[PDB]
Design a protein around this ligand. Sequence first.
Ligand SMILES: Nc1ccc(C(=O)O)c(S)c1
Ligand SMILES: [Zn+2]
Ligand SMILES: [Zn+2]
Length: 260
Amino acid sequence: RDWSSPQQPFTIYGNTHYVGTGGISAVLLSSPQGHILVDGTTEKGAQVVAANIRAMGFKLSDVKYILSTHSHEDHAGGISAMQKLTGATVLAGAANVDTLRTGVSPKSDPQFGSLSNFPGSAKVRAVADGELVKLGPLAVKAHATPGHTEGGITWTWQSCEQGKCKDVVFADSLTAVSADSYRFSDHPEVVASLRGSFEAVEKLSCDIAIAAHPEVNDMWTRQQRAAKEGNSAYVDNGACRAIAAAGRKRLETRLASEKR
Ligand SMILES: Nc1ccc(C(=O)O)c(S)c1
Ligand SMILES: [Zn+2]
Ligand SMILES: [Zn+2]
């Protein structure tokens, strides 16, 4: 389950398909009028994501938007390659646009000093908090969830099967992690951003959460459960509350560790 590893794709609910690697989520939201891809995985992973989309019966040229959670190599490293293969427009939070274009994270990032660069993408555009991305019948909402990065976005939509619908959340990372030289306690904007994000995420309408690191919401345990129980195994309307709680715990543990 490495970040670049092959992973046979699978449908989670309705027109929501997992097309990522063994270790990094990517989702295709499909329609007869064209598709939206969420995240690219790693640079090597782009070849996995591309093959996975085709394996689910879709054409790369029909992917019209690529949505970015955040601009680190594990989630975004494959975006540039996928953008070239698809012709899609890449959408991201305002403060991560430059990072996606250059593939270099800025000094505001708590991990700055310890991050690896990744390939810069063409056709990157900003979206605002609350903004709707529409493609034919698809409607995906952007939710600003900064803190791990300034431009982090958590993306939400509804998928349906014969009129039975579920709220799906592609949850950005909410993790307080840094270079050795960084003190969160010295950076009130980052702390406040993280805390606002925990609050936003624990309030989302959230039947099915797909975390950018899939194990954050136990994707592989759920998939194994789904073999007998069906796709209700992915459904858990407390999952966003739980992702937020774990984010809060990681930050509180970190701030305690920093006390003089
Ligand atoms: N070192 C870390 C930890 C956590 C994440 C994350 O996405 O939560 C990343 S990219 C890097
Ligand atoms: Zn990250
Ligand atoms: Zn990550």
